[PDB]
């Protein structure tokens, strides 16, 4: 391949009954977990001197659905270049050609402590909460500007280091429901980027109080807890709900007013409570956006409009393509080949 990177030396090892063939660069691999779509080892990146997560995708081209999902994840990870968002440090295959291309490895930021983990051994100050939520919204302004929706924000998807610096991880490539917006939990209407703002509101409330905000046990129990705080849907929102059955169910509920959040959160920063009221609006079209939230006075000590960048536009037209397995595979291989590592 014209002007491609030199192929590193690979070495083979079996780890949890899985063959891993990775460049010499990655040393001291040790298993961290396994999902349905791949398994993850922590490793020492001898090129950067950092510990990294190396994900080997599990049979990435098994079907059309899996092959397209593999391409979607690689396209997503290659696009995102932001301090508060997971970035692709490396992607490699041991294959020297498309004909032997079978395995895909993704190298990213190693999840040490997530947000749940950091509260288990300390009490966060309001300064800590301000900075953590600011970084989530700064990352979200970036991904939303490219028309990317995370879809599954929760504390276990937010990595935090010892400097209280945060990265958004584990994007939804399309479990607890406590952080999910009501309009997607019951499929009331289409996914909008406003669903990520709802999740931030749930996360922030939990960081401020130490209690999960809506810890329901099923979808109905959860909806009733949500509606108790934010009120039943008004007539404007009911018009936007597409399923008639969902509308009839909502209209069957005893009407409830929105609660006064200041009563619910006595002792919390009033600017924090004001921001929460703007994030946990039931109508998604009235929720504050990530860009607007960064300008809220709650973040006055961190907000810098010259240091809150937006993303390049992200071409998602591939999503409407209907291709053979080997075509998605060939597209994925092209993206592995075209990958340019980040500097340093």
């Amino acid at each position: 391949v014209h002007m491609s990177q030199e192929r590193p030396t690979f070495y083979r090892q079996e780890l949890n009954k899985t063959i891993w063939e990775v460049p010499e660069r990655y040393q001291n691999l040790s298993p961290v977990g396994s999902g349905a779509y791949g398994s993850v080892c922590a490793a020492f990146d001898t090129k950067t001197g950092h510990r990294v997560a190396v994900k080997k995708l599990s049979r990435p081209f098994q079907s059309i659905i899996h092959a397209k999902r593999t391409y979607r994840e690689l396209r997503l990870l290659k696009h995102m270049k932001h301090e508060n968002v997971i970035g692709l440090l490396d992607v490699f295959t041991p294959a020297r050609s498309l004909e032997e291309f079978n395995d895909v490895y993704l190298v990213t930021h190693l999840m040490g402590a997530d947000l749940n983990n950091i509260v288990k051994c300390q009490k966060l100050t309001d300064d800590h909460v301000q900075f953590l939520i600011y970084q989530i919204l700064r990352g979200l302004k970036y991904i939303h500007s490219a028309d990317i929706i995370h879809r599954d924000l929760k504390p276990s998807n937010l990595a935090v280091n010892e400097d209280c610096e945060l990265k958004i991880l584990d994007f939804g490539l399309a479990a607890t429901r406590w952080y999910r917006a009501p309009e997607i939990m019951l499929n009331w209407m289409h996914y909008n980027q406003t669903v990520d703002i709802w999740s931030v509101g749930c996360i922030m409330a939990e960081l401020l109080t130490g209690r999960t905000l809506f810890p329901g046990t099923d979808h109905i129990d959860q909806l009733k807890l949500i509606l108790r705080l934010v009120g039943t849907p008004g007539a404007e929102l009911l018009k936007k709900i597409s399923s008639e059955s969902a509308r009839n169910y909502i209209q069957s509920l005893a009407q409830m007013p929105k609660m006064n959040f200041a009563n619910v959160f006595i002792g919390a920063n009033p600017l924090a409570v004001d921001l929460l009221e703007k994030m946990l609006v039931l109508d998604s079209d009235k929720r504050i956006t990530a860009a607007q939230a960064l300008a809220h006075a709650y973040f006055a000590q961190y907000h810098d409009p010259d240091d809150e960048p937006v993303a390049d536009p992200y071409d998602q037209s591939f999503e409407s393509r209907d291709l053979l397995i080997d075509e998605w595979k060939s597209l994925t291989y092209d993206e592995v080949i075209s990958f340019v590592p980040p500097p340093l």
Binding site: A113, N117, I118, K120, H128, V160, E162, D163, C164
Partner: peptide, 7 residues
């Protein structure tokens, strides 16, 4: 913002 302990 200062510093956090690792669990």
């Amino acid at each position: 913002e200062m510093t956090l302990k690792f669990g």
